Design a protein around this nucleic acid. Structure first.
Ligand SMILES: Nc1ncnc2c1ncn2[C@@H]1O[C@H](COP(=O)(O)OP(=O)(O)O)[C@@H](O)[C@H]1O
Ligand SMILES: Nc1ncnc2c1ncn2[C@@H]1O[C@H](COP(=O)(O)OP(=O)(O)O)[C@@H](O)[C@H]1O
Ligand SMILES: Nc1nc2c(ncn2[C@H]2C[C@H](O)[C@@H](COP(=O)(O)O)O2)c(=O)[nH]1
Ligand code: BEF
Ligand code: BEF
Ligand SMILES: [Mg+2]
Ligand SMILES: [Mg+2]
Lengths: 112, 417, 48, 417
RNA sequence: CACAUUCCAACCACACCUGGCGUGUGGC
DNA sequence: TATCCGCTCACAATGCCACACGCGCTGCTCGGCC
DNA sequence: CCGAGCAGCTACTTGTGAGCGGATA
């Protein structure tokens, strides 16, 4: 089952690490083991005004939790790509994914 | 307890009301401090307050709700709103909002908006379903805005000649070109009266920029409509501020599919203001105006258009000429060919004390064929051909006499046969 | 105490700061981020 | 998913389309943000995008692809292109390009051009095999551009008198000299209609500089051709920008051996703009115009010529006179003897509401012998000799009557015998 | 009526400066 | 299950003085009741 | 969009003492 595991990256490089891991997944043609990035930085919070009304697609903690199937090859692939300093989870090295309640919570944060 | 209920009644009612509520002498405070202290002491008895006002965006992110009592300026009774409400309910400048309010909580100094109930006279649920202004498809004016009262009063002539000189429509672009002390004020007052009588469905607003306070106080109680003004008591920062306020109010209202009609007096004062608040860009021409100092008047005036989906924005501003300073002239210069309808008043006719002093053939309306019917257009052409060979002054007198004999313009047209 | 923390205006826009200032600033940053995450009902593993 | 497919359809189709795609309320954004978010969410499903647009060179080296929806300006949906592509495929201002595009990648904010497929409606392989503009050998106009429709409609007269007053050809240099409110707009609209009907092979483009938005929206849906405009809502920087955009588009297209016809309205507005964006050089003459402030209008107008290898660039601009300000006059002054063809419209004829109000003998075309045949030229000389002793107004009426009796100009010529 | 202070001929008050820390070198 | 043995981690290693020098670039994130 | 502050781009010491298993009776 495609579980939603959490991964931490270098401070600021969250989207860059997301695109790097996507290119790595498309590289070793292992799409049957992973899902998508699910970048939770849906924080369109902006500051508008005199000639300056751009948006900010940022303002979120450095977490790029990815939907995937936990496996030896999958873990070694998501760790082989650099800038993956953080693999959160209480474990030796094989953690437990997130539950469906927080899945729907972050989905609501995505929609809002 | 609503904000407008204390917003509209005069200062005397506020005095007796606060003296009844057992207050410190409220006669020592300003109107805004009067309403502020009264709402404070009312909430101190345990009531949840309701309020209303027009929103202004600030560059720090949050917004402030102003009223027409302060002419849309900063005051102690302005209602603070967080940027996150502006996000969720899609707020912006010009959105008039009424709903649940409370006084500033512990350590704060401005009212807070709890619960939105009316966004531009609409449900806040559909307020997010709006169309923007620049994405609009403008058009020419098709619907005729008849200015004639039909009762045949003495001053009503100055309106009927309107229907004979320069037709108006929903979304028209009109420029009043007249020297000082020619009769623009009475003309504008009659315009406002006729519009408020014949078309009470469209919202009517008037701009007074750098005017005299007596004119303001006479205007605010002669027209049936909410008026805003700014005298010379205040810096041009206030004038530009109220300018964004009124223009964004009109924009949001026409986005809500409403017909807005703004009467601006005068565009020369507004141009002077915009020029004096704009920083120097090194581009100076004759008169002392910066090159980008006119971008804001151009914006305010080009805001006028006729929308196709519904609603329109008519903007009728007066410009001043023959004031002895070339700078004013240059302003009028760039506003020469920008408008499609003009009311030319010559001082030569007003010098004889014959009113209204309107230059007929120097006035006109572009694409006026879509505003009137075929019979009316043919009669207008015949009247223009009759008045063209004669001069300005006694020819205007001829029109005034031919208008005063008949009751409405139907009898005048039939007699012209 | 603030003046007990070495912070002197160096030549130019730069300031000669102390090593404790960076520590306190990082502590405050992570504390504020944690307080933000607790309000948004972040996942248990994230707040952990 | 192509850029033009969302570029041309109105805002309403974009609304329903995004509401179908399960979007945040797109009614809160601008047209450019609408297309931007829709293309974002489309690529988020995994599609490679195609796009198109006209290139603009920047001084930092890279280029940006603009559309006619933004009137060739900066926007969120502009396609970024690296300078190295401009090097290899020999790009420059005016080169319209269509090909593979993707949304901005991680951390970027503008679309990127992957693969070039069409450079000015040509293969990008032959795009490097082009001839420059200044190396061209200009000539006079030889091919006749017949403006007469031949159907004999009521307004078609204003076109037939064209073929009788001032002939046009491929690469002609024409100046419309007329006071305000004389009938230049309807004339230009008929010109555009007749060209798009009789010569659909040549590309047709129109310039509207500092005009009213109603005229823009009426023009963009009356002619069969892609139009660009710039109202007074915007600073003169926008006007000069769209000026380079359109002139370089015409230049690249005529370099690609295509016949370009540009109708500019009005050159007085463009001269005012060029004067107000140019810095002061200490050289001021009467009117308030810098000496080098006219170099850019001179450049834009001298861009017109007739190429020998193939293709041509016809530029027909209108100038304003009798506007009360001497500055305008001075502009027309330096544009007096620069054009080889002129359409003189006098307000004296338009004052009687008889259209078209064209001054016959004050109008004319230099070297018109190479545009028409011998019979046509002799008949033109005879008509000029017949109309010369009479005045302007009722002589124009005489031409209008003699034109309205016959169906096309062949019957008129045969009757003139 | 009461609380509380009172904005200006010499001059008193309005002064005077980088070891945060590390590294390198040398001497005792 | 007690208890000696082997592996692992914290702590230490003058003092003074003199001179000289240093902490960058691109990139990312947070800053704001008038 | 603007400005302000901050982050990514190891092994020749040896000795002493204490603590934590650990394996042997
Ligand atoms: N319809 C009208 N009826 C009566 N008087 C009029 C009318 N229109 C203009 N006037 C005259 O015009 C004058 C306007 O004065 P003033 O406000 O100084 O001119 P302006 O409006 O140019 O500032 C008044 O004295 C008034 O008598
Ligand atoms: N061929 C025509 N037939 C009928 N009316 C015309 C014709 N040409 C011009 N007009 C009249 O002239 C006016 C044109 O206005 P406008 O386009 O603003 O002229 P300009 O652009 O010269 O100022 C219209 O109101 C229209 O009624
Ligand atoms: N516009 C406005 N400014 C006021 C008022 N009362 C005080 N101010 C001053 C005090 C503030 O320091 C300054 C503007 O505050 P903010 O930093 O924008 O305005 C008022 O009623 N209106
Ligand atoms: F007094 Be007026 F407005 F010139
Ligand atoms: F188009 Be008009 F001549 F201003
Ligand atoms: Mg007045
Ligand atoms: Mg026109």
């Amino acid at each position: 089952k495609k579980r939603w595991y959490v991964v931490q990256a270098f401070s600021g490089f969250e989207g860059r690490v997301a695109t790097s891991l996507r290119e790595h997944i498309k590289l070793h043609n292992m799409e049957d083991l992973f899902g998508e990035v699910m970048v939770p930085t849906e924080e369109v919070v902006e500051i508008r005004g005199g000639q300056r009304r751009k948006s900010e697609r940022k303002f979120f903690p450095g977490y790029v939790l990815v939907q995937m199937v936990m496996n030896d090859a999958s873990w070694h692939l998501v760790r082989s790509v650099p800038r993956v300093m953080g693999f959160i989870g209480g474990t030796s090295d094989r953690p437990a994914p997130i539950s469906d309640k927080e899945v729907d919570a972050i989905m609501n944060r995505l929609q809002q | 307890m609503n904000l407008t209920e204390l917003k509209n009644t005069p200062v005397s009612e506020l005095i007796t009301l606060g003296e009844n509520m057992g207050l410190e002498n409220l006669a020592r405070m300003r109107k805004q401090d009067i309403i502020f202290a009264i709402l404070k002491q009312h909430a101190k008895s345990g009531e949840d307050i309701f309020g209303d006002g027009v929103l202004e965006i600030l560059q720090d992110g949050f917004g402030f709700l102003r009223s027409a009592d302060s002419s849309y300026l900063a005051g102690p009774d302005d209602i603070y709103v967080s940027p996150s409400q502006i996000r969720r309910f899609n707020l912006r400048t010009g959105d008039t909002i009424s709903g649940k309010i409370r006084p500033p909580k512990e350590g704060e100094r401005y009212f807070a908006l709890l619960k939105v109930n009316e966004v531009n006279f609409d449900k806040p649920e559909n307020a997010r379903n709006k169309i923007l202004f620049e994405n609009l498809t403008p058009l020419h004016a098709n619907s005729r805005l008849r200015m004639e009262r039909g009762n045949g009063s003495t001053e009503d002539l100055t309106a009927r000649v309107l229907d004979l000189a320069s037709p108006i429509g929903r979304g028209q672009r009109g420029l009043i070109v007249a020297p000082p002390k020619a009769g623009k004020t009475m003309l504008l007052q009659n315009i406002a009266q006729s519009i408020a009588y014949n078309h009470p469905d469209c919202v009517l607003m008037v701009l007074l920029i750098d005017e005299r306070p007596e004119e303001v106080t006479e205007m605010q109680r002669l027209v049936k409509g909410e008026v805003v003004a700014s005298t010379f008591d205040e810096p041009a920062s206030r004038h530009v501020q109220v300018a964004e306020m009124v223009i964004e109010k009109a924009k949001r209202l026409v986005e809500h599919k409403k017909d807005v009609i703004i009467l601006l007096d005068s565009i020369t004062r507004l141009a002077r203001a915009y020029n004096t608040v704009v920083p120097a860009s090194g581009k100076v021409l004759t008169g002392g105006v910066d090159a980008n100092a006119l971008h804001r008047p151009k914006r305010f005036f080009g805001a006028a258009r006729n929308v196709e989906e519904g609603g329109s924005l008519t903007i009728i501003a007066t410009a001043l000429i023959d004031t002895g300073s070339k700078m004013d002239e240059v302003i009028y210069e760039e506003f020469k060919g920008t408008g499609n309808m003009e009311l030319h008043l010559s001082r030569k006719i007003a010098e004889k004390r014959v009113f209204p002093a309107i230059d007929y053939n120097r006035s006109g309306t572009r694409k006026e064929e879509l505003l009137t019917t075929q019979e009316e257009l043919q009669k207008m052409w015949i009247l223009r051909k009759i008045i063209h060979p004669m001069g300005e002054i006694d020819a205007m007198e001829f029109l005034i006499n031919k208008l005063a004999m008949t009751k409405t313009n139907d009898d005048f047209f039939e007699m012209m046969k | 105490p603030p003046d007990l923390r070495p912070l002197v205006p160096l030549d130019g826009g730069r300031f000669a700061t102390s090593d404790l200032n960076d520590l306190y600033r990082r502590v405050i940053n992570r504390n504020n981020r944690l307080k933000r995450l607790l309000d948004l009902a972040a996942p248990d593993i994230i707040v952990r």
